[PDB]
Amino acid sequence: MKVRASVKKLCRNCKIVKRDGVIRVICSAEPKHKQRQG
Amino acid sequence: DPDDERNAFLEVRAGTGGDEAALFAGDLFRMYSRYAEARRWRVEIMSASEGEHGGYKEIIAKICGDGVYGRLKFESGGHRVQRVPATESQGRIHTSACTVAVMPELPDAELPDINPADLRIDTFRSSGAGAQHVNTTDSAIRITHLPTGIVVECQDERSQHKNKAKALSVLGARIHAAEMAKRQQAEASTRRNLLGSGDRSDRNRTYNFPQGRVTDHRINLTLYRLDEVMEGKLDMLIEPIIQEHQAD
Amino acid sequence: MLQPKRTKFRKMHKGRNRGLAQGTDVSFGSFGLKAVGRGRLTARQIEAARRAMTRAVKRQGKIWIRVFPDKPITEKPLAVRMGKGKGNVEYWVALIQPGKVLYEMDGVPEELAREAFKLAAAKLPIKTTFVTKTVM
Amino acid sequence: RNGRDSEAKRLGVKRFGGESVLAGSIIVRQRGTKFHAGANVGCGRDHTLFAKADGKVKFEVKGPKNRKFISIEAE
RNA sequence: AGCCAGGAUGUUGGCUUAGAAGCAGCCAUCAUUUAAAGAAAGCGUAAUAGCUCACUGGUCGAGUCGGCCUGCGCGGAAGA
RNA sequence: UCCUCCUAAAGAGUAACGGAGGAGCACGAAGGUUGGCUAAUCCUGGUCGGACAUCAGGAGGUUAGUGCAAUGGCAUAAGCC
RNA sequence: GCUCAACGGAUAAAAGGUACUCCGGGGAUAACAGGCUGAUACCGCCCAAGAGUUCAUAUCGACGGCGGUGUUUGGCACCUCGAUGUCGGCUCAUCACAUCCUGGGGCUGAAGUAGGUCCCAAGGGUAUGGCUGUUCGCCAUUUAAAGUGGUACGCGAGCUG
RNA sequence: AUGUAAA
RNA sequence: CGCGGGGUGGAGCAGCCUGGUAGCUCGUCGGGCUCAUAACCCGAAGGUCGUCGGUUCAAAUCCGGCCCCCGCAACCA
């Protein structure tokens, strides 16, 4: 998973979640777009 | 092909009978100059070593334009000369041989990037003598270039930068020398294959002046002209070789 | 790299970047890249910002560069002590005031210029904004 | 390469307007002619305008190109 | 915003005849039936086929979608 | 050692191995007075003559010149005869 | 009559070596170190052309930029010249994780093994010989690994030289 | 000073 | 860019210091001599002194500006 500092929506199925303060970008379509802290 | 439209180097060298073969190498320069001025080619003499009784022993000449190498591929080899030899005061027949090399352009894409991300720089303490600085400060730099395997060791001066500049200059010189040595070996391994020993053996071209015929092994050609041959007009001999070379 | 040709002097003083901007209004194109942050832009930054803005806005259109550095900045060789004369001229900076028009573009849609000026702001260190030429 | 710099010659306006000066007092030390000789003001070879009377100094902007003039009123 | 629907017949279209055919690149980016349909934004095929969105219906039934100015915060922020 | 611009913060002054440059002369005239005149750079025309000899006309204005490297000044000319 | 140009001119008249040195001193001033900063170095991030059968983002990444550390070279001399012994080696270790292995997981251009990259985690371990005084490096053979640094780039009132 | 090679 | 040496036939040198004249050698071309090659002899071309502004009756020269080539550029006891 990607561990970048700036997080944008890559595809159309990206969703901005705020799990435990950690801003995550989840994707139900492609597992490669799931990433970490932003 | 890309090489086809490319320019060429002609290297006409004297073989057997260096007195006579220089006179025939001058005639081959005359041959390909009259063949070159017919189709409007540029002829520049890069190097020409003169003989004794006239002519030239070695001629290296660039011909530029659009399509020199692709039209002159099949000229590397030997040339037998049966003629009343200018030299003979007596006048008997002889085989004067000459060797012709045809080299392509191979344009120089020199000086690749030094790639400091690929350079492993080890800055460690120095050996030798001189002061306290040898104990604590490093003053010794080793740089290894990974895809080539070249190690440069510098322990010359006190500061590292003044040794970093020397180490990069030695890296540039050693990489340029190792590339130009491979290029000169690639030139020589092809020139040894194209140019033979220089003897009169039959190597693809046969010449016959007192008979009026030249026979070419490289696709037998038995055309008795040598007067529309001695002043340009060599396309016909060259053309069926290309015709049965494009079949393969 | 943008570089002046045969100026009167080779080296000049550092100076400060005080004062407000003069190039505020857009004068040539229909849009513009107005810079908000007070900073200094080297000539490599302008050349790279031209490179990664020109390719996305393709062979049509027209782009104006409203700034020119014309200010020489030196750099001392390393492991050389302080003093001993001013250093050798290395690069060229433009002192950019708050609200200074850097690039302008005409012949493009608004969304294409919006997406190109974001990349031009990403290639530059100073903060910019997006402006549009109002008539008078 | 650089480093040479000269000693200053202490130019400028020594006697400003309003102040009464004696006869022969130096008013303005100038390099060229920024000020010109008017009433009761002499000019030297060093372009140094000096006093010729006992009065007050007055600056005027007469002339076609608005050149400066120093005058001295006998007060 | 979700939910069962639609999202067409020639378009195997002329193109470099091996195929690019709604979706490599060319340009044209028509027009009908019309509650609605871009001769197409994406996925997938050698090209098809197929799957969604554009948009339009219906159940539903109250406010919602996208930008500007800032205040305080979040992360980037890891040493012996 | 000395001179000129900045540094130098609008009187004077002001430091750094700061940034640009020069001088260790010359002049019997290039000095004094009197009298008279205004260049540089372009355009047109003309035998040699051609981008530039010189002259005539026009624009232009002190960008010319001031022995000398730079600053200030100069037509009432300090420029020229 | 002085380029007495060291030009307010010590004589009219004067170059060098000291590791054989010696004295009065100085941290007013250097070397080793500690201190401040981080041009340089190492590492992390922003943007994105492009490499990758398609496909920037599996892995890389030009042109550019922003930050962290005080581990290299640097800069200034703040402390030391009425004395702070430093390089390498032997023994003894301590601490941080920017993790070499073991452990738990995510992506993959991950069929399985063997992999590439990344997050958390310092509890434990983290070579043997030749050369060189050498740290380091190469070679030979193991290992699961042959980690990076700080501690006066550790440790001579513990030891050689 | 010299002037190779095919009776 | 900073410093030094310069820019003289196709090439290398005089000649610059100290001004009043373009010179020498090698080379190129052509012709004799030999049957020829080498050697020797003769003739021709070639540069305005890298270029430009000033002093001078006169700049290849003296001075300055520009262009080009080569070499030198921080060590270190």
**Is residue D19 assigned to a domain?**
yes
| C47: Cα within 13 Å, side-chain hemisphere | 10
φ/ψ of B20, rounded to 5, equals -75, -45
Tell me, yes or no, if C79 comes closer than 8 A to chain B by beta carbon. Answer: yes
| Domain contains D4 | no
**Rounded to 5°, angle at Cα D52 from D46 and D58:** 90
Measured between beta carbons, the chain B residues lying within 8 angstroms of C79 are 159-162
Could you tell me whether strands D68-73 and D35-37 are parallel, antiparallel, or unpaired per DSSP bridges? parallel
Asked whether residue C51, judged by its CB, lies under 7 Å from any atom of the DNA or RNA strand G, the reply is yes
Q: Is the residue at D35 inside a domain? A: yes
Using the CB atom, is residue C132 less than 7 Å from strand E?
Answer: no
Q: Is the CB of B198 under 7 A from strand H?
A: no
Q: How many domains does chain D have?
A: 1
- C13 found inside a domain: no
Residue C11 lies in a domain: no
CA C86 vs CA B165, C7, C73: distances in Å: 22, 18, 10
| Per-position DSSP letters for B115-174, written without gaps between them | -TTTEEEEE----S-SSSHHHHS---EEEEETTTTEEEEE--SSSSHHHHHHHHHHHHHH
- d(CA A10, CA A13) in angstroms, rounded, equals 8
CA distance C105 to C31: 6
Distance of alpha carbon B126 from its chain centroid, rounded? Answer: 46
In a domain, D2, yes or no: no
Q: Is residue D44 part of a domain?
A: yes
Domain containing residue D31 = 11-75
Give the method used: cryo-EM
Q: Give C78's contacts in chain B (Cβ within 8 Å).
A: 161
Closest CA of chain C from B159, distance in Å: 7
In angstroms, the CA B21 to CA B207 distance is: 13
Q: Which residues contact C35 (CB under 8 A, 6 or more apart)?
A: C96, C98, C99, C100, C101, C102, C124, C126, C127, C128, C129
C12 domain residue, yes or no: no
User: Is D66 part of a structural domain of the chain?
Assistant: yes
What CATH number should be reported for the domain holding residue C64? 3.90.1170.10
Task: Answer whether residue D5 is part of any domain.
Answer: no
Which amino acid belongs to residue C105? Answer: M
Residue B161: list chain C partners with CB under 8 A. 77-79
State the total domains in chain C: 1
| C95 in any annotated domain | yes
Chains C and B touch (3+ CB pairs under 8 A): yes
The answer to whether strand E lies under 7 Å from the CB of residue A36 is no
Q: Does B161 touch chain C (CB under 8 A)?
A: yes
CB atoms closer than 10 angstroms to residue C57: 20
Which nucleotide has the least CA–C1' distance to A10?
G57
Is D20 inside any structural domain? yes
Q: Which domain holds residue C39?
A: 21-136
